[model samples]
Target: DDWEIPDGQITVGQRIGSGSFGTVYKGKWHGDVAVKMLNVTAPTPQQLQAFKNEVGVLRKTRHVNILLFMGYSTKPQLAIVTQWCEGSSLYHHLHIIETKFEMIKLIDIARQTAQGMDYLHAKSIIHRDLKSNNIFLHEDLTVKIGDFGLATVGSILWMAPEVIRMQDKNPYSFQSDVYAFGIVLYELMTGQLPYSNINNRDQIIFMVGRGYLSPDLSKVRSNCPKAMKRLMAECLKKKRDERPLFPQILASIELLARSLPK
Candidate 1:
């Protein structure tokens, strides 16, 4: 039998927050958990497929840095249940609360992200949407990357050139995830949102798709190690082939971690 929760056992409580796909609620399913219920109760075939697809991926996922899927319920609403992180998201930490992270801390966060990504890529899963907001931070500051399956590809700031331009022959790949990871890295290093100066969506897409822009490199703190900088550059390359795979990125980050002082 699959991990499917009966609607009766779930106690939906306070609203945690909402995303484009659904609203998340803090609920009890034996204990405190996050229930992300899809917005469309009568979902289009595509939407339901994506939700079920996410459940399939979550079932196979088991990692400290990836959100843990408890189970799911199909009736009442298409929803997902997962272990809730107490510290909110990287986006909230960096933007809403304006929390600052030390250079060493940023590297560790990036390292944990890469580790999670490395696992997903190994499983042939492309987290087409990888950004700070989708990255959850635990009370202990552990990073748990979430929001799988719904790859609507909306965020212009995080979209890789290949993804933005949409080469008809090529499907979105792990490299696309790495490109977004670069933007997240920049966010972590500078404690700022990507392309904060720009507000026009079309202009942002044009500039990024044409390789005319990327995160402002100068904003990366002076204390940041050069290897991390190099990894960011490699990940953001316009030519998807130029970007290092997660394995290479993971190796670089792990080595960089070893060299950093406590």
Candidate 2:
């Protein structure tokens, strides 16, 4: 039997966006609540798992930086209801005003994002995909990390050299997540991908493998504060063991926040 949407509810709404698997419609319910329905043609086990993971994880976690999952359904069609965030993805905002914001605002975004990542890491969840596009900011500039589809239990880029070298021997750990978090921090501060110029993934891996050069913030954001640049450099250390832990990062952010003028 088809799990029909409630009667008289206008499902006719603009299609906001679409992804690899589904299209997102911006619809209204009860004339007030905004809902997004993911229209899928055929669901795979992985897609089903992703849906389950999103619902299960979001339903249990309540943090200002994570998307709020209102509800979900899977009968007539696979759909997920969430508190509609009016502000679009951070990617759109960045593209619009790539050169507009000051350094302090970027730091604030980074700090708020770090807080979210800290919470997730504490819970042993590694957001596999942490990038500008996945971050959402409200009118007030509060950042909320969303899109947990690729979030798994380990870090693909943050493992220690030995662990990375001996792929079969290393088990995914929370520290690996710290590495990815550092990359995210770099992006927030600089508004650039870590290795944008490097086209080859294997070459990038080799560079990272040889510890050639981590993201040089000074080179990227020439006007960024010296202290902030130094902090980012430390976080992007090639060796996972050299990178600062999440707690240390939080403390650094607090220090940076206090240093700012009113």
Best by lDDT: 1
What candidate 2 gets wrong by more than 4 Å, as runs, is 1-12, 18-22, 30-38, 96-99, 152-166, 169-172, 199-202, 220-223
What is the C-alpha RMSD, rounded to one decimal, of candidate 1? 2.0
Candidate 2 residue 248 C-alpha distance from true site, Å: 2.1
Error of 2 at 121 (Å): 2.0
Clashing pairs in 2: none
lDDT (tens digit, per residue) of candidate 1 on 100-169? 7887788888999999999888888788889888999988479999988654327677888888877777
Provide backbone clash counts, one per model. 0, 0
lDDT of 2 by residue, 1-262 (tens): 3323543444537777753235566666544333444556677898887777766666555788886655566755666655566776766766556545677788888888888888887776776566666677866478888766556643334333434455665434556656666666666666766667777877766666676745656554776666776677776666667777777888888797887766
At residue 226, candidate 2 shows an lDDT of 69
After TM-score superposition, the amount by which residue 163's alpha carbon in candidate 2 deviates from its true location, in angstroms, is 9.7
Instruction: Point out where model 1 deviates above 4 Å.
Output: 39-41, 151-153, 169-171
User: Residue 123 CA error for candidate 2 (Å)?
Assistant: 2.3
